[PDB]
Amino acid sequence: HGGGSGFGGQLRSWNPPSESVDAALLPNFTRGNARADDLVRNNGYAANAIQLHQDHIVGSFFRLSHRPSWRYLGIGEEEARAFSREVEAAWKEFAEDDCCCIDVERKRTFTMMIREGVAMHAFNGELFVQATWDTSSSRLFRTQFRMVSPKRISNPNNTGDSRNCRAGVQINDSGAALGYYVSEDGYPGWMPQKWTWIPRELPGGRASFIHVFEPVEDGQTRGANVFYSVMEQMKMLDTLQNTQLQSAIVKAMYAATIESELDTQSAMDFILGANSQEYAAAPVRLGGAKVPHLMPGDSLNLQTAQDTDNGYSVFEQSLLRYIAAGLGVSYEQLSRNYAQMSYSTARASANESWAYFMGRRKFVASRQASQMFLCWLEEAIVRRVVTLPSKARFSFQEARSAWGNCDWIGSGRMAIDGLKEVQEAVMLIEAGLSTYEKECAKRGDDYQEIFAQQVRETMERRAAGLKPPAWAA
Amino acid sequence: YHGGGSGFGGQLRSWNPPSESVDAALLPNFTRGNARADDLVRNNGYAANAIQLHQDHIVGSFFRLSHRPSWRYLGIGEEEARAFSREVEAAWKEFAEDDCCCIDVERKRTFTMMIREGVAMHAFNGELFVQATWDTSSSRLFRTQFRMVSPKRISNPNNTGDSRNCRAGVQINDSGAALGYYVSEDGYPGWMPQKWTWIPRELPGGRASFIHVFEPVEDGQTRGANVFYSVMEQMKMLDTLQNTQLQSAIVKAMYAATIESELDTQSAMDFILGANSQEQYAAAPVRLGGAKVPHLMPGDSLNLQTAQDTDNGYSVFEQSLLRYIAAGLGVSYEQLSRNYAQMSYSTARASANESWAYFMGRRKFVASRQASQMFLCWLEEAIVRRVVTLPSKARFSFQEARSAWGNCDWIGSGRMAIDGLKEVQEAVMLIEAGLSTYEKECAKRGDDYQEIFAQQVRETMERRAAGLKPPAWAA
Amino acid sequence: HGGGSGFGGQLRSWNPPSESVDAALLPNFTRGNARADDLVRNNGYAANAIQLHQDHIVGSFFRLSHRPSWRYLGIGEEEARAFSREVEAAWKEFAEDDCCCIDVERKRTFTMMIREGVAMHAFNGELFVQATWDTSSSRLFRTQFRMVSPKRISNPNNTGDSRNCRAGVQINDSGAALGYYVSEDGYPGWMPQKWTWIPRELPGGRASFIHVFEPVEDGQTRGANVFYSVMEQMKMLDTLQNTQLQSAIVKAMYAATIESELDTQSAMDFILGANSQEYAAAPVRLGGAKVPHLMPGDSLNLQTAQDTDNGYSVFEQSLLRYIAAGLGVSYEQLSRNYAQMSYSTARASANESWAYFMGRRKFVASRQASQMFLCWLEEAIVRRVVTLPSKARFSFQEARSAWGNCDWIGSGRMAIDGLKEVQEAVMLIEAGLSTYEKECAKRGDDYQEIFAQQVRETMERRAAGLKPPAWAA
Amino acid sequence: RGNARADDLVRNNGYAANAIQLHQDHIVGSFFRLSHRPSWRYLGIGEEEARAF
């Protein structure tokens, strides 16, 4: 019933023309992305939200744990874990290279690559990273990952969209992507722009161009930035903030008035002190109380003005509540307002935001990181850097997902209190419901080097002969 | 009774709802309702947030699978049962979360986010369609693939009328059970006309080519309805209140003052405000210095209006409307509104408890059903390919015992802690008092017990090898 | 004294007739059901109430526990236990069949059967389940169930109600039902409908039709939806909500008024900025303060509007309190406001609502489920899929209830605190005041398979050799 | 007429219907179990026989 006409007419003329999400996105995709860029780069709340996304979804570090499927290939866990630690060491050496040689621009590190990718997916709808093979043999690995902004992927020569060519994305009959038309920069605008078609998949099976996003319904080719639901409200809120600030300026910049048929200069001289005795009308020295002697006919009135904020703070309250609902981050995080909050309420809000951020990490950062991991692993294996066991039933290409199966550990949820958190972890270990690996992962560490470091610490302490720690015999 | 007829002194005399079946009250403008719901979710913070928590709570980040075949019904020794179960679980784990992204034809989704998409689709349109396709290419070990189909693609071919057994592009028998569907090819851009294709619901071999999942309310309903239907108009008018009140605050805070001179504008601003000194209409900008007391003569006056409060009860009215909206959507009010203030511990527990109960119901009846459907579809291809060794002495083959063989359950992200220490204390008391098993506790935390036991054994072995310390599971 | 006229006349003209509730219900039965459908489909509170009914009466699952009357039939305990175990296994296999072919519509499962029936009885007054024997023998059981809406049960050809034929229900002299006049699908309305007479009881003793509703007094044939005492109030609350929303819209929309004798175009040109240099009148750019120079005879009256919720929220509060009293659910559950809340108070309110929910589950969900179970069990017996003991004193037909005596376990009472409840249950079952069966049932589980699972878990742990759990020797 | 007014109130008033609802749900609740305790001492019958009966 509610979809037809509404109560008493009401929404008699609200008829959205039901369409596929591509039909609603592509015609204004560039304008929406530009508006999102403007909002993120010129609004405090948007910048704070993007910063929160980067620092919570990923955080300071993005550690890797490689878990190849030994049981699928029947390979013994001993050699499997040996190979796993070998590739872990090699990837650790490659990832944190201070030369920033993992990217062609030589301006970022792998963790910063992940953070930039997730931020780009958030405030633009998706991300694109291409893999290149430089000819410099001085490096062990010749694979470089170069990110490209979604603005740089569009229809060549601004050609109109077709069935198989939408937004410069080559799509087959089934809807899968095959190639992308990417343009170089246009700065400065004097030089013309050209386009290059990059196949999504290189013929040998090694991915060359990885495009990451999540859809809302079938046939979608480009994602939608999260700001779409709240961009209008955010811009109007910014306008309200600026206008209210200017109005307070004005109402506070007219303190009093003097009415007199006398000359203005004489009026200032005989009322507001003045210094005409010695362009700008008259400066007035700031001194004592200076009671004047206004004459029958003239008067001096002190403007009482108006309260600078007549509830506009509550309007911010509601508006950033709506916006925080829009981006899914907790309101108190977005607005940095933590008033009238108890322990349970803050814990609940943090819980919801943490759940959302883990969802984003699994479905944005984890996928991109895994893609680059497989791309690097292909080169590492083919370059004889790491040797696969001879027992391997399947070659690397056939079981590429199984061979390079891995997970990623970001910055853990560091607690509101911690002592309760640490007590929970301790008694969880005592009860046996959880293992050490999950505890370290939740705290953001990996248990294997934790055990190695504890062994080092105990042997060092025994050598120095002070006291065995709480792990002995 | 007395309320049925006319009401209290006339009252609702004109309110005579036209009682028909659900289809007759939904099919006429079903497309318009779906369009309105889609527009609401696309361009409204609250609706997008609501579907966001739907996805994030109904299934969470992961959707683990456990396969519990009914060996007693199959009359098969439990040892072969668990062996085959772990084999199929390993195969399915490899196939599902593979980075090849060849589970889906579009090569852009994974299994868990496919379930998320299905849950959201069933949320803001009341339905979900998954087409299972047998790929011809032999390059892949598993030729099965799943493509999500939007309900907008499901409609009566050529936009004709609806017969007794042909409703909204769905073919039904006399009993009302669906036999097939009419899926329209996507029509972007709006130039080339669409064409329709018949997809039989079940393959002749019993395979489920098409899977339609929705929560019907009363029999004969071939098409579900979105949850938003109860509160669409209220959401839209709340949005209009947002925009209108915001513009009103804009304009009321705009005009700070008014000057009431009978002179020309230029001289008026020069003598009352300032400006002028032009280099060489837009009037004249005024430098924002300080103080700036003007002088007046009779006939002139400078009036600066006080405007009005920007939140003259707006926040609390919005609170009530959002309360009603959340009641309609079935999620807790604070979750939708991000309004956790003034709330004690017990009340927070109660509200979260209600919302979580609703979410688990939704997951059991929506996500689990679709996931089990695709799992059975994949298991058919897996077993017919002899990649998994069926037990030798099975009383029934796979075809006739499809549900029995593929009896499975799904574990999403668990109810994540509100207190931290208290729920783990609860679990400890349970498994020491013998009122529960490790399976239930691990599931409540989104884990399975078997691999946890394996990992604990591995950690014990590793610590013993390193000679560090035996953990709290020894001998 | 109270019933005659009242103080000072007062109710001098309130003389409701005295008749059987059938005489007060049947004449407007269809209109009442129509109003109930309207409210449940368009009012958010009604939908929330129905959802609460669904997920609290039954919840997410409906487990079976078949306890036959072994002592009454004089059967051995062990044989009866084994028979119960096998029929339970068979029924559990049949109920959650992923074929969805438990019902003819192939659209829902047994838990969905119960949910749909409970909701239908809630917002329509009753529920009808039509049992059917299928001809195709491809499956073990040939029994399916349509869930016929009460809207489809009516007098054939809309004939007037007789003594023995009311609302399409055939009633004997004693008042017991004998058959029902079901109607086919009426969509679309072009094709005329026809009515089929279904006997309530099949000659052999199989329940062809199941009509479930709790009566209110003698001779009732159709139930009454719970909205009857409340629906007018809910509809008018909806109207108040919409009207207040529109009024707030209007009051906020008109911000200022321009008062001048000028030409109106020049009026906005000289006052509200305007863009006359470029009929939608004239748009106004949004910028700074924009102080104007209204001439003598002009004004820029800023409307102060009015508070948008001048007590509407508390009036709401009262109305939803009345409504929640009407449908028996807790006010906080229905209205989703949980403020000024204490632990004991929340416990009390949830306690009352839970008592109501267990009552409704026993008298609606449990009855329909039991009839379902007996209908399936008759076919199960006659198909020899389960064998009756030879000791059986009575045939299945004579002792149908005794053989099929069973109870059902819905979603457990999941508590506000739980930990206190957990300690309570622990010291119950160590104090001997209860038993594991009732505790696990209250938590929503069954004790037999939980014991089997604990045995399996300890066997697995012993095999892996980590540690014996807290159930050994 | 008094009874008719009572039914009118109980059928078309939220508070009255609610009150009847709690009457039913609290006075009797969900179940009404029986416990038969025959007066064996007055009957002069064996306690074991009384319990068996």
Add this chain to the structure above:
Amino acid sequence: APVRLGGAKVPHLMPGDSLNLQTAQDTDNGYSVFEQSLLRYIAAGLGVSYEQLS
């Protein structure tokens, strides 16, 4: 004449006409406190506790 309740309505009363919404008056202007005192007196007379009676 019946009037449909169909949302906000703005009329155009000509000069000489006026529609005025009568503000009415509080429905419990201290009546609850008078009840407080009165049933306190009643409970005192009856011998039962006030909170039980009222």
Add this chain to the structure above:
Amino acid sequence: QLQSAIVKAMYAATIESELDTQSAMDFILGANSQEQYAA
């Protein structure tokens, strides 16, 4: 009481012009642009 509220917050605003209803509502509220009483 409820019914009172229905009409207490349903008239909202009034116009005190001396033109015809059509012209007054056009110049003070909006409307017009009719495709072809009900005001």
